[PDB]
Amino acid sequence: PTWQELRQFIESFIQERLQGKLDKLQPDEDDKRQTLLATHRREAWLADAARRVGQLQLVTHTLKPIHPDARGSNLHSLPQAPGQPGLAGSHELGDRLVSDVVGNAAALDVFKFLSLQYQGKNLLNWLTEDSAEALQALSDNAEQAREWRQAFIGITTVKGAPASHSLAKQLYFPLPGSGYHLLAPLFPTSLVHHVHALLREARFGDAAKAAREARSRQESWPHGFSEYPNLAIQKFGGTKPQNISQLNNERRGENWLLPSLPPNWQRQNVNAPMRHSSVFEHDFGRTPEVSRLTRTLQRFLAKTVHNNLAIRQRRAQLVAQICDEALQYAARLRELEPGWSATPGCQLHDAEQLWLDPLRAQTDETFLQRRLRGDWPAEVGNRFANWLNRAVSSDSQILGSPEAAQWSQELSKELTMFKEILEDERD
Amino acid sequence: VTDPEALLLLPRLSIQNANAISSPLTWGFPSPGAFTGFVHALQRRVGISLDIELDGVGIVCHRFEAQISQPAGKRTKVFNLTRNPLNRDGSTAAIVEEGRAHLEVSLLLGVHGDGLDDHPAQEIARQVQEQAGAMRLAGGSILPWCNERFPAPNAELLMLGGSDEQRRKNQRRLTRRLLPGFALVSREALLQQHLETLRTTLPEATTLDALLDLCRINFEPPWQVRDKPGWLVPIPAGYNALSPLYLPGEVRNARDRETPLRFVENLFGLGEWLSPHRVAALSDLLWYHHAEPDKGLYRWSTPRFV
Amino acid sequence: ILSTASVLAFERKLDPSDALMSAGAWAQRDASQEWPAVTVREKSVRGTISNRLKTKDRDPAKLDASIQSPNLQTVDVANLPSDADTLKVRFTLRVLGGAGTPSACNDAAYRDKLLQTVATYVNDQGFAELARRYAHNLANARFLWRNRVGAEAVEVRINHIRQGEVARAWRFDALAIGLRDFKADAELDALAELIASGLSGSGHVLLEVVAFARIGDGQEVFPSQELILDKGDKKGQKSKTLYSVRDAAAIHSQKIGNALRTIDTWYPDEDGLGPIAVEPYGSVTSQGKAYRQPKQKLDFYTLLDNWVLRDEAPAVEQQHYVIANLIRGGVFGEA
């Protein structure tokens, strides 16, 4: 409201900076105190700040995370909210926006001179309006106030020509009718800082650590937690993260990338089940994916029926995943030897061996090539269904009610699809 | 934007050092925009001479290996780096952390045009395969399968089937070819409905938080894990406008002074990896460009999926 | 006025695969398709302090206290098996066409001038000397690096794969062909003709390069060490890590490319080393010194602006160096 309290606050700020640099320098002689107070104690420091606001730039998307010998145009722009559904971005950052600072590592003090809360609001939004308390609290003269306001508000607007350096990325995009756009991307350091802050609360917050301790104590808690596995660290600055930006000095490197990985990103090995009796209960069932699927079926089998059919839809989808993995198992059985099924052995699951090794029809001209064609083995999934019958809960309440009927119906449908898949293996 | 008249199966392609950092927020499998741009570069280089159009790519990703390591004492991971050459004064240059990944993917390409009636299917298939064998897919060289046991040619299958059963058998055989992999599809509808579910759970929740909730493992107190419909990776869903579309000669140090440049920001969506037998047709897996250049929104998606 | 393009980038021509390392016996190199791969294992080392002291910890008490604390590391080691004296290193090389064609260029006039300069280079002498030196660096197994140092016999087999078959098989004695002399041979000239046709062509030329080194039985092979930054973490890590693809030791593609590009015998410093890798500002990481400095008129950038803009065509050796940089690639262009 009053200009006098803003003047008192900025004089207190420059006095705090003066006593801080006096304590840091610790000078007792050589006239260092007079030279320190001759440039950071009066309005001329604000004039000195006029030499510092033109060097700094307040941005939300910068180019300096891309190769640091590139000099482009870092721009502060909030992207428009897309009309298409189901996709995010930096447009989702509304009032939860932190604006990055780029420039020198010594002018950055004036950033807090643009980020104080004197009247209860940020001073950049105070200087974007022609307020009555504005242009009098910092300058007695009108024209000095106007040029100081223009220089102090120019930290948001992009300086120089619109430019992207050669070391920056530029990627052509095909237009629908006969065109291209060059589309240079910038690093969303505000969005990355927001995601890194959310991950900090998720992994090292007090409530998250309390929920982790409650999980470790196996007790109840009013809220849950998360883990965020397989995170990747991408440090931008090698020696001086402060040279990248101020937000990259807050989080020193550590881009904290999310694991967008395919399910076969941790392919262990391919193994041939030689001296074993059944593939589904001894080798295929011990893989961790179908292990989590079978524990999920065990959890979903003994449950209430209030969301039943919807849960059953999920259950149907769940059971589909398991037979998918069975095909996936057969898929990596295409990566093995052509004739592993013809090796000697007392028990090697010969009922499943017509589907386990499809390439032995190349090995044997008529000993076993015509056997898979004439037999058309599709009953093996029924054996797998028997293994899937070990994935259900041993509850008599499901058998008494129609839950077992729905389970048998979706099981019959999915193994009908599995048997139809296994039928046309000869093509 | 159109139904493909044929589907061309580029086989197992071993991409050597692909860009593992797909996005400023995600790492791992590369962007689908890289695959769509590769198919458009294939159409730009050899598609026009064959009188065909190549739009829409379905990714299977038969193998993934990340050049990463886990340091001791941390549950996160770091990227293995390459030693860049020294500067002119003999000192080590500043390191830009770039991650690499060895991929093995097979691509379904949507082919439409009169040239399908002008050439044999194996001829245009072999031409686009030998063009693609000297290109890059996500920043990595493509290993063109020299001196192994049995090389894999393409199989261009015409989607204009004479009968529904023959078309079904063709699609099931083409799915059987690309079996040890996972189709990566776009899930804008699932992410939007999960955003609505979270907004009913708690208001003023952004799409970023709904995307994050569909990727972290949520632990619920009675201690169980909140399940997910699929793999539900966070993918780069395209590019949104960050600047007005400047003139082709306006932007300093552009790639070319004939293409207009516009500064963009990455768009993040939800993708899903599925077993490819769980789709009605293999043309649903095709990743299509969608520009909408008046409003930014330079997206890639899988239209006609469900 | 023919200003330089502000972005100017070239593809990696001669892009190799990762050099897969396996083990076997000499005179069984014909049936090397079933050779078991070299696996990278872990082991522990307890060394003692042997680095230079900076005259503050040279007192006997502090030095004895430092020895009394045991220095321990974990190292990734790759060894041959104790019944396999031969290391086989196999990779695939794609000689790409359009060697002088840049990936990106701002000015159309600069692109036309650069294409005309490269076209005059092919019309004058072609890629014949450069592909001769590339075929030399394929012919001796410089890509084996430290696997080449103490080997009894190194033999390189290079197979041209046209469609799906070996179109032409070259066999070279890698130890007879020196690491520093680029002589003339008939098989080497045929390989040079194939690589130069691949560089001058529109598609690509595919080669399978296999090198058998008789290092010794059970000896230590040297794959590429992975560059992992410790990043100032509190927990101690393994000091040495190696590179593998799938339980199979390998060399990085950039190391094989650096060995293939070690053709530069025209730098203004004395050639006591011999050839160095073709780099802008002639950087050698094994020396810590950069030859072909821009204060002399023999760095790649000033040679390109003299050859292209001001039409000051340099000597034939420096033209070979410039086109070897163009085949090498790189990201150029002033702001």
Next chain:
Amino acid sequence: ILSTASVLAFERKLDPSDALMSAGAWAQRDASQEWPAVTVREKSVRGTISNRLKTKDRDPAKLDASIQSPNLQTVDVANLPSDADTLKVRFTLRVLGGAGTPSACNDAAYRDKLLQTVATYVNDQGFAELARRYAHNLANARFLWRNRVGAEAVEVRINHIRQGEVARAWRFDALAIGLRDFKADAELDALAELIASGLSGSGHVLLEVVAFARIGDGQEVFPSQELILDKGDKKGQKSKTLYSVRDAAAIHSQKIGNALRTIDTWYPDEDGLGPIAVEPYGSVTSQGKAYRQPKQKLDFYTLLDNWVLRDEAPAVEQQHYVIANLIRGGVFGEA
């Protein structure tokens, strides 16, 4: 002023392998290529209190309480079978040569001066005493560290492998050749000449060294032992883990190297202990005390900075020590 280089990295000459240990019988050691390897099995130990107390638990009540409830551990143990008395240890040594040339050097003039220094050494006194002591350390089985301390009879067979065939065979009684006296023998002089030819670069020398030691039926053998960071309870109190490559006990290559480097008999202290391993600041971890400290002007770094930088040539035995350090290799050089 000829300052020393910041990097002076040297490669390792006399490259050893992981010495695999198998088991067998004496007088059947001629046919020992089929001998089964010693397996690293597991056993459990109950550890009683046998260490010095810290003058707080010395009360009888807490001592008896700790003794009443002792602690159990699982140890990896390597033993011979109950019908096998002879331990066989096999490794291949690779004598490279070019010991004066460093792999990396920041200063070219310092590299030239070091090359001239090593060349004047070789012209004056070549690798004759050094190779004699290396052949001594191969002849007695010092690479059997605790497999030699109570062995009844040790025999070392060294075969020069040329083109996959044995060029020359040496058979030494390792107990007659002491661990401290460097005497002369005609076969040992022939092996010294072979290692001299390997180190001078005049030939490629690979040796297969097989040591047979009579320890006893079922006796515990001592391979290399790994560091264990975490014991825990998921791993059943794993206190000792021995080294093995594929179901086969083995010694580390650097332990064989340290046993081979034990040639330094010229440290300023008394030679009543005998030779010590060649290292900068002559450090012995078992003794816990540095022979050749930097204070007494006889360590490797001051002798190298006198011999090369200031042309102050040391004594013949001390320059033997310096060249033995150059053969050993390291990360010599400041920061």
Next chain:
Amino acid sequence: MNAIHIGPFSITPAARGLHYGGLPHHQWTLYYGPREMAIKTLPDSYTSSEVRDEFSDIIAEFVIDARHRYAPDVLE
């Protein structure tokens, strides 16, 4: 440094210090009275909170095993 006492638990270091990697290390030992449960090699740059958090998982596992081992009987 010194022992960390968490109830009946004592995290006591070995007096000897090793140099795993390049950094100095100490072998920290977790006892429940006379019985040790986890011996782990930890850096000397670790604070007491980090040494506590290294053994906190085994501490919570032993607490869970003690709860499920000496649980009282249930009458229905």
Next chain:
DNA sequence: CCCCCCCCC
């Protein structure tokens, strides 16, 4: 290109 101040270890 050299010197000084700021920031990081």
Next chain:
DNA sequence: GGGGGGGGG
């Protein structure tokens, strides 16, 4: 408190 590095002269 010391040493590196950015920024100004």
